[PDB]
Point group: C4
Chain length 203, copies 4
């Protein structure tokens, strides 16, 4: 099989996603880019994470064509491909439907520097405006909201995080979900203290 290592990683981290509470059901999706070949491994659409085998992962080229795999690729594949076409610093993406990030996103709010952990994404995390699930418009909105960042909130939908490898992409998704929990909880009872921009640069 093509991209064997990547396929195994997508299976492993999909299990980690549902187990960490970062998604519900079969929703959410993960991809890993093999930069040497120009090929993308992506989670299959609508399969349970603990029922997914490496052979179920789908291999795409950057035009969205299936190169290998019998399963349907994630319905959100356009939102993954755009990062591998239009940046060179992202080789893996974790897209979650996680509750605290989705909460901040569904208010249309940015996530400010409520924690030093925000630095996993940047000085803040922007909120991309709503676009329809599974469309190129949403792919554009996600990418544009994530410029010079490693994560972006998706209004009324969730979060996507990217990094140089899958371990770091997952770390960014999990730590930014945690930051969103802190922002939601502090805003529930008061006004959080925020870190200054130069400290966020320092970090």
């Amino acid at each position: 099989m093509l991209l064997q290592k990547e396929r195994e990683e997508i299976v492993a981290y999909g299990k980690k996603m549902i187990s960490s509470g970062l998604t519900k059901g079969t929703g959410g999706n993960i991809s890993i880019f093999n930069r040497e070949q120009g090929l993308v491994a992506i989670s299959p659409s609508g399969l349970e994470y603990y029922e997914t085998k490496p052979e179920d992962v789908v291999i795409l080229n950057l035009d969205g064509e299936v190169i290998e795999g019998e399963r349907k690729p994630s319905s959100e594949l356009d939102m993954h491909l755009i990062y591998y076409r239009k940046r060179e610093d992202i080789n893996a993406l974790v897209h979650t439907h996680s509750p605290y990030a989705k909460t901040i996103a569904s208010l249309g709010w940015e996530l400010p520097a409520v924690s030093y952990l925000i630095a996993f994404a940047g000085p803040n995390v922007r909120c991309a405006p709503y676009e329809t699930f599974g469309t190129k418009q949403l792919a554009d909105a996600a990418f544009e909201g994530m410029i010079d960042r490693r994560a972006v909130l998706l209004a009324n939908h969730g979060l996507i995080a990217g990094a140089n490898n899958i371990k770091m992409a997952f770390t960014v998704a999990e730590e930014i979900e945690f930051c969103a929990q802190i922002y939601y909880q502090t805003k529930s009872i008061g006004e959080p203290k925020l870190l200054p921009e130069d400290e966020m640069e320092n970090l």
Copy 2:
């Protein structure tokens, strides 16, 4: 045994319900309709989900008479039967006592389009007014609140979701509970952005 497949599914999804945090104790209940025979399989009353065997599931006809099974059928069976009598698009029901749906229900509020996932149920989810547990009045209220929808909130009680099969009925219950969590959390700190009606139709 009658409805063997359905019995096995009710056992499996009952375990999924308690494990997903969608109910407490022995509360909540699941049914599956065999349309070909006019028979309903339903979870037994007051049994622990991880102690339930396929033989413990009870088979009813549409008049509420026990056709097969030694256990007492769910005390909420009237609220299940009404859907199999008065609609033709529902073949399975998942009734939960889940916290975020019950929260919105106990305010007497509808659940509006805070997420694209609301479309699993419809353009919104209504709240049926309170009626006493285990009665035909509650069955009527649930059904009437769920007209042209796949889920309804039950004031001071919980949620019921229905669909063409048990996998989809469970999916609707879990995703609408998640939507209720987002609505509760956003309303705690601000005013959520809602999706327009034509987008909900689009979805």
Copy 3:
């Protein structure tokens, strides 16, 4: 050993308590009364629930004297014994340090009829005023707050629930914790609808 059945049940339900999120650490405690003998089995003080064996459970008489067992009985034993002396309808007690009940208790608030599940305890659940941990004063406060009820909130501390057997006592503790979660969450965003007194009698 004396009260073998009761000892095994205390071990089993202690595990259920920590696993259900109804307590933290070694805190909380469970007792079961053998009415025929006038003997009380109670969880040992400061032992981890998954490290507790039936022989670790302590047997007391109604004067608080150790009849059998090498372990120290729960430091909260006075709050258990009073129910077995001064009522005849309670044969088991589950005392939790659970977050939503403790939240309502730490405001000094009663828990009103926000759910039909409140009927597991009565028409409402009172809040006993604060008294020092491990004292007879707290035992008196708990008992007095629980008159004609199967549960009571303990200000800045937790909850105790009692019933005719251990399965029902645990059920009351878990369902009243759930009701407290609904009350906390509804009060966070609005004013919950409450069930009328005659309906609570009906239930």
Copy 4:
């Protein structure tokens, strides 16, 4: 190996930390001081807790020099060493990135006597002002905020707890996180009742 017992305990309690929800990812860190030798065992930097073996734990002297171990010691090691240099009552430290403590910390608030469990730390828990992750400035801030206490909140970061042994240090971290949950939840809907200073002394 040096400090074998301590190494095994750090592995065990690191697993307990992630499993109790007291940290995310590889963040957080635990140390145990061998007072007889003047040596500190500390969790390694960036290793998954369930992938950590006793040999992965790092042994330091009080000058921060590695005495034994091939792994990099925790990046937060300065915040541990200061307690073993400047107090004599602390022999173990549990540093968490737990959500409710971090919430109160990120508002810059003290945690007052909302529960008798606050007495595990003292009459209250102070909030140390923000200092950069992994620095001696943060070590100083933590220590100074924890004077005459067994825990301190770290603004926009988390919590550290210390005690005479690792079991008690973990207990303090877990129970103070729980107290922070109660404070956050009560403040969300009202004004909590607080215990008086003389009662906190009594406790």
